[PDB]
Amino acid sequence: TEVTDCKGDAESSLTTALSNAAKLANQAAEAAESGDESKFEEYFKTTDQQTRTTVAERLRAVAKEAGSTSGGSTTYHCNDPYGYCEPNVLAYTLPSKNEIANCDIYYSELPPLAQKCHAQDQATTTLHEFTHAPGVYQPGTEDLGYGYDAATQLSAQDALNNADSYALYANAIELKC
Ligand SMILES: [Zn+2]
């Protein structure tokens, strides 16, 4: 990604989150490719190979995008330059522009890395947002279910196309939960 619009230690929060998102996304891609079927099914509601392949491809693409700070297909603003953040929103993506920005509460309300199952953190919020960018992998995902219950109660095709499903799966793989 092209990191821009950064100030302070928040810049380091973002670069840490990018590097962690890359590792988490590669690890989750490996799980989708070759890991436990039941765990995959918990999040994506199927064991079918084509779905596993698509999830893995999307995650591998996210990992590559997260692995640069002056490159790739997206632009990542440390801070919202436009005023598009709404109350309680951590970050957002403009899919037609492949542009991502964090809201201020990303920095005040999230740990870098959650220790608890399904809990939000900077790395997985960043991972979530990359899935929305069609330039990373098309189609961009939608916001169909946020958090464990809403995301995992989606149907298979909605989960496949739901950003938070990827964040949740990546957290579950890392935490072994
Ligand atoms: Zn989203």
UniProtKB/Swiss-Prot annotation:
Can you supply one Gene Ontology CC term for this chain's record?
extracellular region
Which species does this protein come from?
Aspergillus oryzae (strain ATCC 42149 / RIB 40)
Recorded catalytic reaction(s): these are: Preferential cleavage of bonds with hydrophobic residues in P1'. Also 3-Asn-|-Gln-4 and 8-Gly-|-Ser-9 bonds in insulin B chain
What cofactor is this protein dependent on?
Answer: Zn(2+)
> Which domain of life does the protein's organism represent?
Eukaryota
Which positions are annotated as binding Zn(2+)? H128, H132, D143
Kindly report, in one word, the top-level EC class recorded for this enzyme. Answer: hydrolase
Q: Give UniProt keywords alphabetically.
A: Cleavage on pair of basic residues, Disulfide bond, Hydrolase, Metal-binding, Metalloprotease, Protease, Signal, Zinc, Zymogen
Temperature notes read:
Thermostable.
Name of the protein:
Neutral protease 2
GO BP annotation list:
proteolysis
> What residues form the membrane-spanning segments?
none
